Amino acid sequence: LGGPSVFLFPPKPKDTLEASRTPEVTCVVVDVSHEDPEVKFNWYVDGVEVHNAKTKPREEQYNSTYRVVSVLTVLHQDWLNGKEYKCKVSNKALPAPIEKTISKAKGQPREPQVYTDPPSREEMTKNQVSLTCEVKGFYPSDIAVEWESNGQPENNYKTTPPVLDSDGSFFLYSKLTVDKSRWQQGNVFSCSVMHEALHNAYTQKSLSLS
Amino acid sequence: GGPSVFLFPPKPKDTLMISRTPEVTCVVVDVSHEDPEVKFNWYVDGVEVHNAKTKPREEQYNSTYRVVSVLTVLHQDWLNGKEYKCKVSNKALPAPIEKTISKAKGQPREPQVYTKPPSREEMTKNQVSLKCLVKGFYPSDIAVEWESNGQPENNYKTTPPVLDSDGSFFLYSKLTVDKSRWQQGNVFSCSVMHEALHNHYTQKSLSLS
Amino acid sequence: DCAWHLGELVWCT
Numbered sequence: 445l446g447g448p449s450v451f452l453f454p455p456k457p458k459d460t461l462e463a464s465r466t467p468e469v470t471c472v473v474v475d476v477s478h479e480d481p482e483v484k485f486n487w488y489v490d491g492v493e494v495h496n497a498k499t500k501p502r503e504e505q506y507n508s509t510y511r512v513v514s515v516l517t518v519l520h521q522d523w524l525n526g527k528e529y530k531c532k533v534s535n536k537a538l539p540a541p542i543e544k545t546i547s548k549a550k551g552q553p554r555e556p557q558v559y560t561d562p563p564s565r566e567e568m569t570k571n572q573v574s575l576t577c578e579v580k581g582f583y584p585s586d587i588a589v590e591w592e593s594n595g596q597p598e599n600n601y602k603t604t605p606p607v608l609d610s611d612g613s614f615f616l617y618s619k620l621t622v623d624k625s626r627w628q629q630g631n632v633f634s635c636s637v638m639h640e641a642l643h644n645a646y647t648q649k650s651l652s653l654s
Numbered sequence: 655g656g657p658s659v660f661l662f663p664p665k666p667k668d669t670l671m672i673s674r675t676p677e678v679t680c681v682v683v684d685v686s687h688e689d690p691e692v693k694f695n696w697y698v699d700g701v702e703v704h705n706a707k708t709k710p711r712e713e714q715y716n717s718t719y720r721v722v723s724v725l726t727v728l729h730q731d732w733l734n735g736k737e738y739k740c741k742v743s744n745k746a747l748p749a750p751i752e753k754t755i756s757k758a759k760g761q762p763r764e765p766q767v768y769t770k771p772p773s774r775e776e777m778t779k780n781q782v783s784l785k786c787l788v789k790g791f792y793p794s795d796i797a798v799e800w801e802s803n804g805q806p807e808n809n810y811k812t813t814p815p816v817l818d819s820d821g822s823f824f825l826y827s828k829l830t831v832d833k834s835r836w837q838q839g840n841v842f843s844c845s846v847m848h849e850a851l852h853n854h855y856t857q858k859s860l861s862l863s
Numbered sequence: 864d865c866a867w868h869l870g871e872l873v874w875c876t
């Protein structure tokens with residue numbers, strides 16, 4: 445052991461994009477020795493120290509190290525306005541306190557273009573068909589894509605990670621796989637996208653058998 | 655502090671194209687100046703081979719050497735699933751390091767390739783995107799390229815392969831072209847190379863109404 | 864038959 449390490453994690457995209465949710469910044473300290481498990485946390489928001497953070501229960505990793513985690517609640521506006529969140533970690537095993545800083549990716553926010561594609565005619569021979577949701581030209585890369593149908597979530601889908609495009613924006617694809625019969629019945633399927641650059645941080649695109 | 659070994663596979667195109675030569679690369683970093691000598695032992699399915707070649711030794715300017723050994727493999731040896739073991743011996747090493755790689759195990763599955771036109775909503779923009787859906791393939795080793803009129807189209811981006819729920823992989827490739835080129839009826843083609851394809855190759859074309 | 868890619872031979876069966 446050469447000393448504990450620190451990893452500072454951002455809040456979930458959906459947590460920052462929905463008013464119902466409460467976004468959190470997480471400062472994780474690993475490789476905390478048993479001899480000196482005492483960890484001091486100092487939180488800062490744009491250089492100003494705050495005192496409303498809470499420490500999660502200590503966890504034994506069973507490799508002779510503890511896992512110490514401090515969680516700081518952030519405001520939706522504060523995160524979206526690009527406030528800096530600094531986590532300072534002090535411990536006897538550290539020659540000097542470790543400081544890590546995270547915030548929203550900086551840069552002009554860009555609105556996602558959402559397009560959908562129906563299955564090919566060749567796909568009408570298979571047991572299941574693929575529906576495509578194309579989300580492109582958005583920034584930052586923080587986003588959440590979901591599917592639904594008749595006010596009910598469709599879960600049989602996969603989404604590619606965001607890919608850096610040539611124009612500096614991001615794009616991704618989400619593929620929903622449904623039974624053929626469901627598709628040939630004329631049922632409407634919806635692709636829902638959540639991103640800060642959308643109006644009310646939300647848009648929904650639909651398609652059906654045409 | 656001691657040396658570490660990284661064994662790399664051949665490039666998918668090199669194994670898929672008969673007009674190319676696939677090779678496995680055994681990379682050794684953190685090689686000290688005091689003991690730069692590195693012994694290589696190569697094995698194919700446990701049987702030792704001797705046709706390997708050592709790349710030029712390199713200074714990493716952090717007071718370490720980078721010793722690399724390269725072994726040419728046969729196209730079908732790699733496609734059949736032969737394992738390649740690289741054994742690295744060094745005197746700054748308590749015991750010789752052995753690394754083994756091969757093609758990802760599992761029955762090869764043929765990729766389904768479907769092309770999608772740009773939305774009519776996208777016709778109001780300066781450029782349009784052509785989509786190539788490649789799904790249901792295994793292993794993830796694949797090459798996806800675009801072309802038009804016998805010439806390659808390089809203005810594209812392709813997502814990494816994504817593990818599907820049925821155990822196979824899928825991906826999307828997006829070629830962006832000037833809208834005028836699409837309106838003039840030019841045909842664009844999505845090329846896919848994969849071991850499970852007939853002649854390791856397929857091509858799907860797409861153009862305006 | 865064989866398959867070609869921009870002039871370069873891919874594979875033949």
Ligand SMILES: *[C@@H]1O[C@H](CO[C@H]2O[C@@H](C)[C@@H](O)[C@@H](O)[C@@H]2O)[C@@H](O[C@@H]2O[C@H](CO)[C@@H](O[C@@H]3O[C@H](CO[C@H]4O[C@H](CO)[C@@H](O)[C@H](O)[C@@H]4O[C@@H]4O[C@H](CO)[C@@H](O[C@@H]5O[C@H](CO)[C@H](O)[C@H](O)[C@H]5O)[C@H](O)[C@H]4NC(C)=O)[C@@H](O)[C@H](O[C@H]4O[C@H](CO)[C@@H](O)[C@H](O)[C@@H]4O)[C@@H]3O)[C@H](O)[C@H]2NC(C)=O)[C@H](O)[C@H]1NC(C)=O
Nearest residue numbers: 449451453454455456467468469470472474475505507509
């Ligand atoms: C002793 O064990 C320790 C842990 O137990 C391990 O035990 C073994 C038996 C195995 O089972 C092993 O899998 C166990 O982890 C071990 O600690 C590990 O130390 C590693 C480095 O020494 C460290 O690797 C780093 O990981 C970073 C990212 O980690 C995330 O993902 C990993 C898995 O991929 C996951 O294990 C971590 O927990 C992290 O996951 C994130 O967790 C956060 C916080 O909870 C989530 O965010 C919040 O989530 C909540 C809701 O849950 C809210 O949403 C809130 O709003 C959010 O803020 C987040 O979602 C979650 N994600 C995932 C994926 O789960 C890498 O980024 C990092 O790489 C970076 O850093 C390296 C340098 O270190 C650079 O080189 C890289 O370039 C890069 O910058 C690095 O890889 C492990 O994460 C850590 N494991 C744990 C559990 O803490 C310790 O080392 C062991 N010690 C010894 C001596 O053996």
Ligand SMILES: *[C@@H]1O[C@H](CO[C@H]2O[C@@H](C)[C@@H](O)[C@@H](O)[C@@H]2O)[C@@H](O[C@@H]2O[C@H](CO)[C@@H](O[C@@H]3O[C@H](CO[C@H]4O[C@H](CO)[C@@H](O)[C@H](O)[C@@H]4O[C@@H]4O[C@H](CO)[C@@H](O[C@@H]5O[C@H](CO)[C@H](O)[C@H](O)[C@H]5O)[C@H](O)[C@H]4NC(C)=O)[C@@H](O)[C@H](O[C@H]4O[C@H](CO)[C@@H](O)[C@H](O)[C@@H]4O)[C@@H]3O)[C@H](O)[C@H]2NC(C)=O)[C@H](O)[C@H]1NC(C)=O
Nearest residue numbers: 660661662663664665676677678679681683684714716718
């Ligand atoms: C001293 O410096 C050394 C390197 O110089 C570094 O010098 C610095 C000053 C900087 O200039 C820095 O940029 C230089 O890298 C440094 O050595 C490094 O050591 C690292 C770990 O100790 C090691 O990281 C690992 O990397 C593995 C993958 O390696 C590839 O990708 C890395 C990242 O970019 C790259 O650095 C390497 O060069 C490798 O790049 C690829 O190499 C393959 C061949 O192996 C190429 O494919 C072949 O391609 C040829 C054609 O070119 C043929 O086609 C052939 O058939 C193919 O096989 C490929 O083209 C090439 N890609 C590109 C784009 O270049 C990771 O896999 C590995 O991660 C594993 O291990 C970690 C643990 O370490 C696990 O946690 C992971 O889960 C995973 O299992 C790891 O990250 C660096 O690669 C290595 N750097 C180099 C250049 O070798 C050394 O440590 C320094 N010493 C000190 C500081 O004391």
